[model samples]
Target: GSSGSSGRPHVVKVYSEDGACRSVEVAAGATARHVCEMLVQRAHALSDETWGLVECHPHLALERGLEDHESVVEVQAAWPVGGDSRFVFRKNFASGPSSG
Candidate 1:
């Protein structure tokens, strides 16, 4: 923890098959945007992570399945502040390459 950290926020580390990758942290009552910002902070540009939820597995959320280049991801979650509902990430190949 940094000496000037934001009051000891809780952080969750998301991992992929390639390596230990994304991480997110939040305060007791963080907003979705705040959680996402933390996730973005830990992710590499190549992580193909946009400023939104990231999909990692094969399901309704991932009809095409996980990309081999990145797999087996994990995240450090916060203690639910208000509700049981959660916002999740999904992949959208509809867009082209990230930096083309």
Candidate 2:
């Protein structure tokens, strides 16, 4: 909940492309890029892999991910605290330079 209070964390429920979910607690005003990093670590994704935090809707399809310099707080603030619109950790599976 965005109580807008000092010390109140912006808890984001992030979803994975495989329908898995993970709860992440981020301080208010945290950058989306930082949040993405947290997701990467929490999911144990390879640091050198092509992965990203993509924004998605409940009953809609995901079309993209956050801008390189966007803020997670700003994006989540626009949705309900526990709403359908949330972020997703997805691997870029189309192509990879290290694909064997």
Candidate 3:
């Protein structure tokens, strides 16, 4: 569990639209974009072609990603680090099909 409850790595879980939370380890200064990349790579989501274009946003802003560790706005810091941040992602699900 990269989810460190104290310092350094501030974890953020990525939940696929299907509701499966993928655990991700993000350094304190890491941005939502950074964490997103880690999530994709670690969760096998990167293998998906659409992952490159997947949209990830903090639970608050649906447009931009977490700018950094302190950038996470919505999910409480104390919130368990084992669940998806609910940072919805959008990808081209038409062509190759991002899988099931």
Candidate 4:
């Protein structure tokens, strides 16, 4: 038997574009956008509207961009057990026909 705590902070590891990663402590109800904001502040990186948190499954060859209002913890809970899934922080912009 185990006890779970509500309204407690949770630790999430976010990976960067260059294969670097950092851990951030966030509230249980924190949203994806909020996490990104926190990471930007900690990393001292430039803030942009294109920044996004991505949910990726390397083994499955699948990915999903987390919505701003989505709960990070809830998204994490949906990951398959013992799977190669992780969160990636990067710029997610729409591909335009004129852009390579």
Query: For this target, which candidate reaches the highest TM-score against the unseen true structure?
Result: 4
* Cα lDDT over the full model 2: 0.68
| Candidate 2 residue pairs in backbone clash | none
lDDT of 4: 0.77
Reference-based TM-score, model 3: 0.42
Clash count, one per candidate: 8, 0, 1, 0
Candidate 2 on 1-100: residue-level lDDT in tens?
A: 4354677677887787678898778887667667677766756556655455677777555444775377766776675655478887766633445553
**lDDT tens digits, residues 6-83, model 3?**
565656655677777676665555555555566566654535433422334444444433333433423334234553
- Across 20-72, the per-residue lDDT of candidate 1 in tens digits comes to 55556555455444545455554563444444444433233332222323322
Which stretches in model 1 have alpha-carbon errors above 4 Å?
1-8, 42-50, 55-100
The better-scoring model by lDDT among 2 and 3 is 2
1 in model 4: Cα distance from truth in Å? 19
lDDT of each: 0.41, 0.68, 0.47, 0.77
For each candidate in turn, the TM-score is: 0.30, 0.65, 0.42, 0.75
**lDDT at position 86, candidate 2:** 81
Model 3 lDDT-worst window of ten: 64-73
Question: Residue-wise lDDT of candidate 4 within 1-100, one digit each (tens)?
Answer: 3437786678888888789887789877878888888887856567655476898787888778887788788888779897867888877544554322
Give the runs in model 3 whose Cα sits over 4 Å from its true position. Answer: 1-6, 42-70, 73-85, 92-100
